């Protein structure tokens, strides 16, 4: 059987695609510029591409663009998302498109008459952006637009976009009886197939590379492996009884403990034993996959793995230095 | 004679302290954490650190904190600026203490009674952040606070905090007859002596790294070699005719000319010969340094010099890999 996957070129979706065709699906990859050898070579080199993979040219900002992709399949894995690239006008750049495009795809999924189920890949920033961390999070919890809007802290548009985009999504799925799952990844880390440094690993590797601007997203970290998160998606398409949301977080720990763990593995990098504002008494925050793990799904991977894969592949692809 | 340098541990600051010592001066370097080996090593290692360099603890978020270090100096080079580190509340984290900190550095100077001039390092984001770009900018251009605040684009706290900082200062300097200069650099690039990756190098090295978030600053880009920028801070302290604001940019080319320029010099890096949303009739926005060159200041280094200083120093220190 056929499925769509949007944002096929990127970090999650790529791996999602390789795993999808390492099973017996025949897939419809969607990208924006099919001629961007970087974005595409890794998808076509995938064993069984000639006989099963097809590419389609769609943009979230272009109303209607997804119909054909979605024509025919039993599934769509919406993994794709706008960045804040041009960085003049995020309301028009990142939010309008992430909202309208999403609802866009939901319409087109009905129009098909073939789509049995839609899996939105969502963002952890739809859960836990509020002025004070609960010590554990779960699928009833929603980030605070009042607080996001008032404050306008770094990366607000990737919080508010996906919170308005998932919110309005369920608002439709309930209203028009669409079969909607959504997975909520925390920081996705692992090996990867794509050509460049994936966006989520500029952040995970920040205790090595010293990119200060990222420290905040891992001060009280939570993580999955790219390979659990992927198999996790295929689980939730394939496992009939699934409703609502699904957090997909396998670990959680403050910047210091991740630092510790990288130091012991990687001495050849000069990793700081201190970070500003992080004491040893700072409570780790938790994202609970209990609802996932309740269904049957079983994390195969540990924080040490995600990272070995990230460091190993980066080195290989000559993105990270071998040492300092 | 004796000068102050605020945030001595940074990229700009540190190298300015190396230059001022070498030229005969006695430096009171300020930092927020002298117990931090990485910030402070590269300063005590300077020749003449023993005899002509003392160290001080000050933080712009602490009212009064620069009195001691400013005391006794003929000049004060206020270069230090807050980062959006916690990334919870940039109004109170970034802006308030840029501005308060600046006004505090001014009152301290007035009250030291030996400060004959205070050079402040502004930012280019004070000049040219507005909807549509002028083809040339000079010392009379200010950013548009209506437009930063109506849109809240990436980086907006960095723009506003510096524009209200530099503004409030001028209003103060005038009202009290304080000799005062500001230098607006552009994205500063070149060699360095700091031991971690300079934050602005994370931007200039974007084509090599694939840091898609940092392309907007170099899309219509401008530049200044670090060594010029420092000889110009010293030049403008030492030059009696100097008044008001003073642009320090020496080159201006679109992302395409930079990626091309690097590609010819570093074939071992795949650098993309194509950029999304950037065509070849995209004009270059220049920052007119003419006010500064009319005084007699002479720039000594080309676009290439900067990027071979930053590339070499990084390879040596091990923050950019040798190849792809
Ligand atoms: N990685 C993480 O730790 C993390 C954590 C939680 C959630 N997420 C979510 O996971 C999903 C994938 O993230 P990732 O790190 O795998 O992203 P990624 O590697 O950057 O891929 C994002 C993809 O979306 C596509 N894209 C950008 N603008 C688009 C538009 N207007 N229309 C259609 N596609 C567009 C890009 O593909 P083209 O360049 O081909 O167009 C890109 O490959 C996103 O929904 C994100 O919000 C990521
Ligand atoms: N670099 C550029 O291309 C660029 C372009 C135009 C203008 N500028 C400006 O030039 C200055 C230096 O830039 P840079 O690249 O050298 O940046 P940087 O490398 O990050 O240096 C900034 C310094 O500020 C100090 N600092 C941070 N927060 C502070 C606070 N809250 N109170 C007091 N000091 C604080 C830090 O030293 P400690 O941690 O040890 O205190 C740090 O070393 C800034 O004013 C910046 O905006 C930079
Ligand atoms: O999609 C992303 C996401 O959800 C989060 C995140 C993770 C855990 C949290 O607890 C949180 O509040 C946000 O970080 C990110 C960091 C990146 O560099 C890139 C991303 O794409 C995400
Ligand atoms: O810096 C980035 C960032 O902070 C996030 C983010 C973080 C937390 C979230 O919850 C979320 O939904 C997105 O995404 C990104 C995606 C990119 O392609 C590029 C980036 O540079 C970022
Ligand atoms: O993302 C960043 C950014 O855009 C700027 C910037 C841009 C224009 C300006 O005028 C200015 O003063 C600063 O500084 C930074 C400094 C850091 O330490 C870390 C960052 O992540 C940024």
From TrEMBL, chains A, B:
Keyword NADP set for record: yes
Catalyzed reactions per annotation: (2S)-flavan-4-ol + NADP(+) = (2S)-flavanone + NADPH + H(+); a (2R,3S,4S)-leucoanthocyanidin + NADP(+) = a (2R,3R)-dihydroflavonol + NADPH + H(+)
Enzyme type, top EC level: oxidoreductase
One Pfam family named in its UniProt record: Epimerase
Keywords for this protein: Flavonoid biosynthesis, NADP, Nucleotide-binding, Oxidoreductase
The keyword Flavoprotein is annotated on this UniProt entry: no
Every NAD-dependent epimerase/dehydratase domain range: 3-243
Gene3D superfamilies, alphabetized: NAD(P)-binding Rossmann-like Domain (3.40.50.720)
Residues reported to bind NADP(+): 9, 11-12, 32, 39, 59-60, 79, 81, 162, 188, 200
GO molecular function terms noted in the UniProt entry: dihydroflavanol 4-reductase activity; flavanone 4-reductase activity; nucleotide binding
Matching InterPro entries: Epimerase_deHydtase, NAD(P)-bd_dom_sf, NAD(P)_dehydrat-like
Enzyme Commission number(s) from the entry: 1.1.1.219, 1.1.1.234
GO biological process entries: flavonoid biosynthetic process
PANTHER family linked: NAD DEPENDENT EPIMERASE/DEHYDRATASE, STEROL-4-ALPHA-CARBOXYLATE 3-DEHYDROGENASE, DECARBOXYLATING
Family, per entry: Belongs to the NAD(P)-dependent epimerase/dehydratase family. Dihydroflavonol-4-reductase subfamily.
Protein name: Flavanone 4-reductase
The organism's taxonomic lineage, starting at the top: Eukaryota, Viridiplantae, Streptophyta, Embryophyta, Tracheophyta
């Amino acid at each position: 059987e056929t499925v769509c996957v949007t944002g096929a070129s990127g970090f999650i979706g790529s791996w999602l695609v390789m795993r999808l065709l390492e099973r017996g699906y025949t897939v419809r990859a969607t990208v924006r510029d099919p001629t961007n050898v970087k974005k595409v070579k890794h998808l076509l080199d995938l064993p069984k591409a000639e006989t099963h993979l097809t590419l389609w040219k769609a943009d979230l900002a272009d109303e209607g663009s997804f119909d054909e992709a979605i024509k025919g399949c039993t599934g769509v894995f919406h993994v794709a998302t706008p960045m804040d690239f041009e960085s003049k006008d995020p309301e028009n750049e990142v939010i309008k498109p992430t909202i309208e495009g999403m609802l866009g795809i939901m319409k087109s999924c009905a129009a098909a008459k073939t789509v049995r189920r839609l899996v939105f890949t969502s963002s952890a920033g739809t859960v836990n952006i509020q002025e004070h961390q609960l010590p554990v999070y779960d699928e009833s919890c929603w980030s605070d637009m009042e607080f996001c809007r008032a404050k306008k802290m770094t990366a607000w548009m990737y919080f508010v976009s996906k919170t308005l985009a998932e919110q309005a999504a369920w608002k439709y799925a309930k209203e028009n009886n669409i079969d909607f799952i959504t997975i909520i990844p925390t920081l996705v880390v692992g090996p990867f197939i794509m050509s460049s440094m994936p966006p989520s690993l500029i952040t995970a590797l920040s205790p090595i590379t010293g990119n200060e601007a990222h420290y905040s997203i891992i001060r009280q970290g939570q993580f999955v492996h790219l390979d659990d998160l992927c198999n996790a998606h295929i689980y939730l398409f394939e496992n009939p009884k699934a409703e609502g949301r699904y957090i997909c977080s396998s670990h959680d720990c403050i910047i210091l403990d991740l630092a510790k763990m990288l130091r012991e593995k990687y001495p050849e990098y000069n990793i700081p034993t201190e970070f500003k504002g992080v004491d040893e008494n700072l409570k780790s925050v938790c994202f609970s996959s209990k609802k996932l793990t309740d269904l049957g799904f079983e994390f195969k991977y540990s924080l040490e793995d995600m990272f070995t894969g990230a460091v190993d592949t980066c080195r290989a692809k000559g993105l990270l230095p071998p040492s300092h």
